[PDB]
Design a protein around this ligand. Structure first.
Ligand SMILES: *C(=O)[C@](NC(=O)[C@@H](C(=O)O)c1ccc(O)cc1)(OC)[C@@H]1N=C(C(=O)O)C(=C)CO1
Length: 356
């Protein structure tokens, strides 16, 4: 990589790894549209397997960006509309509180307080139906945002109904394949198990456990090369050949709601660029932050001068993606230890600010 890119990347990441005691990490910086990779440490400490450009990491919540784009692609295909009520795609959802709750609300965490997580006790599709039927909104739809995997997760499951494909089949055929993300998976196959890093939590090797709507909210595993291709795709949607996918990417970056300096997209979250690092560095220390939202009516189409980003974690991994369309600049950081979000954003900001 150009020495400048090399130098900022290393002087920022080495101290981060040391301060947070991260076992393994991979970073990609997209500069003027070209990817540069860096790797440190171990994918598997016991087996002394190093992190490489082929190592798979759990993306955790960064998976929501794929769900948002897959949903955008379904809208572009005319299979669903964000303005449709949730009950159009799940008729059995006859509980009256669902009247007025649209796919837009589900996708942007504005349905009225759906929970951060689907209860672990929900193990069957029947359990799932009961869970949503019995849920009691704390607020009217479209008035407050409460980050929720049960919200965007349900959106993903419903968005693929019209197609008749399973969520995984739809993700693979409509998003992974067209973008050539050949090393990105919802279920890691046996052929790839040797590249699947272990996550580390309190010194124990761990992999994310199965759960209701896991594919839709936190189930993707990917390599640093594929994630760099994912950022390139979202940086320049106009270069994507598949029509509906190009539109779906653009739709995921439209601004649907505003809370303070942040705007909510489908999966992606955005701030205006240039951004004050404090506005973003704007943490996982709060298990629930309910925030009033202002609807952007109609939504603002994807803005190039934005800091577009998404953080994610699983018990043993921590990831972060951020890019600036206007500068053809972006970064992906994947680690096999869940460490503080503020540290991720600060590191990413130091690197991208330096390169712009
Ligand atoms: C997304 O990262 C987030 N959490 C997860 O994806 C998983 C985790 O927090 O360990 C997870 C696994 C299994 C569940 O039933 C629930 C969650 O989505 C809920 C959320 N997001 C974060 C972020 O975006 O920074 C967090 C650090 C907290 O977890």
């Amino acid at each position: 990589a150009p020495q400048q890119i090399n130098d900022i990347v290393h002087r920022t990441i080495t101290p981060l790894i040391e301060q947070q005691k991260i076992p393994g990490m991979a970073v990609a910086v997209i500069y003027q549209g070209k990817p540069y990779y860096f790797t440190w440490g171990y994918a598997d400490i016991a087996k002394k397997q190093p992190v490489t450009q082929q190592t798979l990491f759990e993306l955790g919540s960064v998976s929501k960006t794929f769900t948002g784009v897959l949903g955008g692609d379904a809208i572009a295909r005319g299979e669903i509309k964000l303005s449709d009520p949730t009950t159009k795609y799940w008729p059995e959802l006859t509980a009256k509180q669902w009247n007025g709750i649209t796919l837009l609300h589900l996708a942007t965490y504005t349905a009225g307080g759906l929970p951060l997580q689907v209860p672990d006790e929900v193990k069957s599709s029947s359990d799932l139906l009961r869970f949503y039927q019995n849920w009691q909104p704390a607020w009217a739809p479209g008035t407050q945002r409460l980050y929720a995997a049960s919200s965007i997760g349900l959106f993903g499951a419903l968005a693929v109904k019209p197609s008749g494909l399973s969520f995984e089949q739809a993700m693979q055929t409509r998003v992974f394949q067209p973008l050539k993300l050949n090393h990105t998976w919802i279920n890691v196959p046996p052929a790839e198990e040797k590249n699947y890093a272990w996550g580390y939590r309190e010194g124990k090797a761990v992999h994310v456990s199965p759960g209701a709507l896991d594919a839709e909210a936190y189930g993707v595993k990917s390599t640093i090369e594929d994630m760099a291709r994912w950022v390139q795709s979202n940086l320049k949607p106009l270069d994507i050949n598949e029509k509906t996918l190009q539109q779906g990417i653009q739709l995921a970056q439209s601004r649907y709601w505003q809370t303070g300096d942040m705007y909510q997209g489908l999966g992606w979250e955005m701030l205006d660029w240039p951004v004050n690092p404090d506005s973003i560095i704007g943490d996982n220390k709060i298990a629930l932050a309910a925030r009033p939202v202002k609807a952007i009516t109609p939504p603002t189409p994807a803005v190039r001068a934005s800091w577009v980003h998404k953080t994610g974690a699983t018990g043993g991994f921590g990831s972060y993606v951020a890019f600036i369309p206007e500068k053809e600049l972006g970064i992906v950081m994947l680690a096999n230890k869940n460490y503080p979000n503020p540290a991720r954003v600060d590191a990413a900001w130091q690197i991208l600010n330096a390169l712009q």
